[PDB]
Protein backbone atom coordinates (compact mmCIF):
# COMPACT_ATOMS: atom_id res chain seq x y z
CA UNK A 1 0.00 0.00 0.00
CA UNK A 2 1.17 3.52 0.86
CA UNK A 3 2.18 5.49 3.93
CA UNK A 4 -0.51 7.02 6.15
CA UNK A 5 0.42 10.54 7.21
CA UNK A 6 -0.47 12.32 10.45
CA UNK A 7 -1.57 15.91 11.15
CA UNK A 8 -2.55 16.75 7.59
CA UNK A 9 -1.73 20.15 6.14
CA UNK A 10 -3.88 22.63 4.23
CA UNK A 11 -5.31 20.63 1.30
CA UNK A 12 -5.82 17.29 -0.44
CA UNK A 13 -4.57 14.26 1.45
CA UNK A 14 -6.22 12.74 4.50
CA UNK A 15 -4.43 11.78 7.70
CA UNK A 16 -4.96 9.75 10.87
CA UNK A 17 -3.73 11.08 14.20
CA UNK A 18 -1.65 8.81 16.47
CA UNK A 19 -3.57 6.66 18.92
CA UNK A 20 -4.50 8.70 21.99
CA UNK A 21 -5.13 6.91 25.29
CA UNK A 22 -4.80 8.37 28.78
CA UNK A 23 -7.68 7.10 30.95
CA UNK A 24 -6.19 3.62 30.56
CA UNK A 25 -2.95 4.53 32.37
CA UNK A 26 -2.13 2.40 35.40
CA UNK A 27 0.90 1.65 37.58
CA UNK A 28 2.10 -1.91 38.11
CA UNK A 29 3.45 -2.45 41.63
CA UNK A 30 3.52 -5.84 43.34
CA UNK A 31 2.90 -4.47 46.86
CA UNK A 32 2.98 -8.06 48.15
CA UNK A 33 6.54 -9.14 47.42
CA UNK A 34 8.74 -9.22 50.52
CA UNK A 35 12.54 -9.42 50.37
CA UNK A 36 15.25 -9.10 53.01
CA UNK A 37 18.73 -7.59 52.86
CA UNK A 38 21.62 -7.89 55.27
CA UNK A 39 25.35 -8.09 55.90
CA UNK A 40 27.43 -10.80 57.51
CA UNK A 41 30.57 -12.91 57.56
CA UNK A 42 30.41 -15.94 55.27
CA UNK A 43 32.90 -18.67 54.38
CA UNK A 44 32.61 -18.23 50.60
CA UNK A 45 31.52 -15.18 48.64
CA UNK A 46 32.60 -12.11 46.74
CA UNK A 47 33.64 -9.44 49.28
CA UNK B 1 9.07 13.76 -17.63
CA UNK B 2 10.66 14.89 -14.33
CA UNK B 3 11.25 11.88 -12.05
CA UNK B 4 12.91 12.16 -8.63
CA UNK B 5 11.15 15.53 -8.19
CA UNK B 6 8.12 16.37 -6.07
CA UNK B 7 5.92 19.50 -6.09
CA UNK B 8 5.03 21.68 -3.12
CA UNK B 9 1.36 21.31 -2.20
CA UNK B 10 1.16 24.42 -0.01
CA UNK B 11 2.78 26.57 -2.69
CA UNK B 12 0.25 25.32 -5.24
CA UNK B 13 -2.64 26.06 -2.87
CA UNK B 14 -1.31 29.58 -2.31
CA UNK B 15 -0.87 30.05 -6.07
CA UNK B 16 -4.31 28.58 -6.86
CA UNK B 17 -3.12 25.61 -8.92
CA UNK B 18 -4.88 22.26 -9.29
CA UNK B 19 -2.51 19.29 -9.20
CA UNK B 20 -2.87 15.60 -10.12
CA UNK B 21 -2.24 12.40 -8.18
CA UNK B 22 -2.40 8.63 -8.50
CA UNK B 23 -5.76 7.02 -7.79
CA UNK B 24 -6.48 3.78 -5.97
CA UNK B 25 -6.85 1.81 -9.22
CA UNK B 26 -3.60 3.15 -10.68
CA UNK B 27 -5.29 5.90 -12.71
CA UNK B 28 -4.17 9.53 -12.64
CA UNK B 29 -6.82 11.74 -11.06
CA UNK B 30 -7.48 15.40 -10.35
CA UNK B 31 -7.45 15.66 -6.56
CA UNK B 32 -8.51 19.32 -6.17
CA UNK B 33 -10.64 22.01 -7.80
CA UNK B 34 -9.76 25.66 -7.21
CA UNK B 35 -10.40 28.92 -9.06
CA UNK B 36 -8.30 32.02 -9.73
CA UNK B 37 -9.43 33.94 -6.65
CA UNK B 38 -6.85 35.53 -4.36
CA UNK B 39 -9.07 35.82 -1.28
CA UNK B 40 -10.34 32.89 0.80
CA UNK B 41 -13.92 34.21 0.87
CA UNK B 42 -15.52 30.91 -0.21
CA UNK B 43 -14.91 31.92 -3.84
CA UNK B 44 -11.76 29.94 -4.65
CA UNK B 45 -13.97 26.84 -4.81
CA UNK B 46 -15.61 26.16 -8.16
CA UNK B 47 -18.80 24.70 -6.65
CA UNK B 48 -20.44 28.00 -5.61
Describe, in plain words, how this protein is organized in 3D.
The PDB classes it as viral protein. Keywords: Complex, Virus, Phage, viral protein. The entry is titled "In situ structures of the ultra-long contracted tail of Myoviridae phage P1". Chains A, B: Gp22. This is part of a larger assembly, with two copies of chain A. With about 45 residues, chain A is largely without helices or strands. The first copy, chain A, contains no helices and no strands. The N and C termini of chain A lie far apart (about 60 Å). The relative contact order of chain A is 0.15. The interface of A and B includes residues 10 and 12 of A.
Which short descriptors sum up this protein?
part of a larger assembly; 2 chains; 47 residues; little secondary structure; 0% helix; viral protein; Complex; Virus; Gp22
Shape of chain A: elongated
| Category by helix and strand content of chain A | little secondary structure
Number of helices of chain A: 0
Portion of residues in beta strands of chain A equals under 5%
* Oligomeric state, counting identical vs distinct chains: part of a larger assembly
PDB class: viral protein
Keywords: Complex, Virus, Phage
Entry title: In situ structures of the ultra-long contracted tail of Myoviridae phage P1
Chains A, B: Gp22
Gist of the model:
The structure is cut from a larger assembly and holds 2 copies of chain A. With 47 residues, chain A is mostly loops. The first copy, chain A, has no helices and no strands.
